[PDB]
Design a protein around this ligand. Structure first.
Ligand SMILES: COc1ccc2nc(C)c(O[C@@H]3C[C@H]4C(=O)N[C@]5(C(=O)NS(=O)(=O)C6(C)CC6)C[C@H]5/C=C\CCCCC[C@H](NC(=O)OC5(C)CCC5)C(=O)N4C3)nc2c1
Ligand SMILES: [Zn+2]
Length: 198
C-alpha cells in the first residue's frame, strides 16, 4: 500500500583503510547498531579521514574512494542510495549503471587521491583488509594479480582503488575474474572514465 512504502537507507561510512604511514591497516569507526541507525536517519556526525572508506548498507559492505573531491564507489553496492552526512542524506552527483559507477561529493575531512598520469602498468590494489596487492595492468580496464588468491580475499573490496607506484589513482575496483574460485585478474573503472563522467 502507498501508506506503508518503505524508503531504502543511506550508505554509511563504517571505517577506513589507513594509508597514512608505513603500515596499511583497516580501522572501524562505527559498529553495526550505530550503522543501522545512521542508515535510517542519514545523519552521520562522525569525523571522516583519509582516502579509502569502508561503507555499508543494511545488506552489503564494500569500499569507497575519494578522487578529485568525489567519493566514488560501485553501483552494484550502492545502487541509487544517498550517503549519510552530518546534515542528513546526500544525493549522488554521479550515477552510471553502464560503468558500475556512482559518486557523491567527498565528505568534509576526507583526502582525495590524485588521478594518475604516469602511464605505468605496475599497479597496487588496496583491499578492505588493508592488503596491498600488486597487479600488472593488462588493458584499459583489466589487470592480473601477480599472486592469485581465492576470490574470498577480494570480496567486499569493490570501490577500492588501484594505485600506481607513486600512489596516484588509476581506477576503481569493480569485478574479479576467477578460475575455479581463484582470482587471477581484476576489472576496474579507469580513472579516465571517472574524469569523463565528471
Ligand atoms: C546491479 O547493477 C549493476 C551495474 C553494473 C555491474 N557491473 C559488474 C561488473 C557487476 O558484477 C557483479 C558484482 C561484482 C563483484 O562481485 N565485485 C567485487 C566485490 O567485492 N563486490 S562486493 O563489495 O562484495 C558487493 C557485492 C558490493 C557488496 C570485486 C568482487 C570480489 C569478489 C568476486 C566475487 C564473485 C563475483 C565475480 C564477478 N566477476 C565478474 O563479473 O567478472 C566479469 C564477468 C565482469 C567483467 C569480468 C564480480 O566481481 N561481480 C559480479 N555487477 C553490476 C551490477
Ligand atoms: Zn601515477
Amino acid at each position: 500500500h502507498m501508506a506503508s512504502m518503505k524508503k531504502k537507507g543511506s550508505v554509511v561510512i563504517v571505517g577506513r583503510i589507513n594509508l597514512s604511514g608505513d603500515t596499511a591497516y583497516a580501522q572501524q569507526t562505527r559498529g553495526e547498531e550505530g550503522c543501522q541507525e545512521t542508515s535510517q536517519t542519514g545523519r552521520d556526525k562522525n569525523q571522516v579521514e583519509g582516502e579509502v572508506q569502508i561503507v555499508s548498507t543494511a545488506t552489503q559492505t564494500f569500499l569507497a574512494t575519494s578522487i578529485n573531491g568525489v567519493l566514488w564507489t560501485v553501483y552494484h553496492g550502492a545502487g541509487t542510495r544517498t550517503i549519510a552526512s552530518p546534515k542528513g542524506p546526500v544525493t549522488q552527483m554521479y550515477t552510471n549503471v553502464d560503468k558500475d559507477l556512482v559518486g557523491w561529493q567527498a565528505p568534509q575531512g576526507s583526502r582525495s587521491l590524485t588521478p594518475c598520469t604516469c602511464g605505468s602498468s605496475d599497479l597496487y590494489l588496496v583491499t578492505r583488509h588493508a592488503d596491498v596487492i600488486p597487479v600488472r595492468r593488462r588493458g584499459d580496464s583489466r589487470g592480473s594479480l601477480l599472486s592469485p588468491r581465492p576470490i574470498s580475499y577480494l570480496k567486499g573490496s569493490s570501490g577500492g582503488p588501484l594505485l600506481c607506484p607513486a600512489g596516484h589513482a588509476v581506477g576503481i575496483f569493480r569485478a574479479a575474474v576467477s578460475t575455479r574460485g581463484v582470482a587471477k585478474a581484476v576489472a576496474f573503472i579507469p580513472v579516465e572514465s571517472l574524469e569523463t563522467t565528471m
